[PDB]
Ligand binder design. Structure first.
Ligand SMILES: Cc1nsc(N(C)CC(N)=O)c1C#N
Ligand SMILES: [Cl-]
Length: 115
């Protein structure tokens, strides 16, 4: 079901290396709904190429737009399994500290803070 379950470690590593070659200014992001999630819809895709200058606050706005949320629906985004310390950090900086060993940046969203 999950991205990591669908693709071999070798396949995930090779895909990140191709994004490096073909979209060298983009961060490779996996964005998945919490397996428990009742309220929020599923995204149309899993793998996103994020411009490396956008900060986490803007990425949250981007995902809220893509999910077509309204103003009062709650949305919580985990990065690398945990809460974001700050939304002001450029994703280039978040990537260097929070990247997976495969080279993807993993995010999960839910309508509750309690995942
Ligand atoms: C480490 C690394 N990052 S990008 C890359 N490319 C372009 C593909 C490849 N497998 O040669 C490598 C390697 N090595
Ligand atoms: Cl690019």
């Amino acid at each position: 079901k999950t991205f990591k379950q669908r693709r071999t470690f070798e396949q995930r590593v090779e895909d990140v290396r191709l994004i490096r070659e073909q979209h060298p200014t983009k961060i490779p992001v996996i964005i998945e709904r919490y397996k428990g999630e009742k309220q929020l819809p599923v995204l149309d895709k899993t793998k996103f190429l994020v411009p490396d200058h956008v900060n986490m606050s803007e990425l949250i706005k981007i995902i809220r737009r893509r999910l077509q949320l309204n103003a009062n629906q709650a949305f919580f985004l985990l990065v690398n399994g945990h809460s974001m310390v700050s939304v002001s950090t450029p994703i280039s900086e978040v990537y260097e500290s929070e990247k997976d060993e495969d080279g993807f940046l993993y995010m999960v969203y839910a309508s509750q803070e309690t995942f």
